[PDB]
Design a binder for this molecule. Structure first.
Ligand SMILES: [Zn+2]
Length: 116
């Protein structure tokens, strides 16, 4: 499913080389999120399967149609800083360890909720 592949491109990095602004600015460019600068974007780390599992076993309902993880994840949230959102895109990083909320379709993650 292309929506799942997009989710992984935008929101999955198994073993991050960093958790800092340097990491964010690199990752936002490498994952195609700087044309123009995406304002807020979270990367989830660790095992791919456990993220998928949020759609089923490792997850629970979360209104409206969203789902929250049963376990916490290491994450890195990249937040745009500077001025107007044209490259080169500058980011500040917030490393976290918490439960995440996603939207699922066909038992696959398609959407990451950035409301935290
Ligand atoms: Zn901005």
């Amino acid at each position: 499913d292309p929506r799942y592949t997009k989710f992984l491109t935008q929101h999955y990095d198994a073993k991050p080389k960093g958790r800092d602004a340097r990491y964010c600015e690199s990752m936002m460019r490498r994952r195609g999120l700087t044309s123009p600068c995406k304002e807020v974007n979270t990367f989830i780390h660790g095992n791919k399967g456990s993220i998928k599992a949020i759609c089923g076993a490792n997850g629970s309902p979360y209104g409206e149609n969203l789902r929250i993880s049963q376990s916490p994840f290491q994450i890195t949230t990249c937040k745009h800083t500077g001025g107007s959102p044209r490259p080169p895109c500058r980011y500040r990083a917030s490393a976290g360890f918490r439960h995440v909320v996603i939207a699922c379709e066909n038992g696959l993650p398609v959407h990451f909720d950035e409301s935290f």
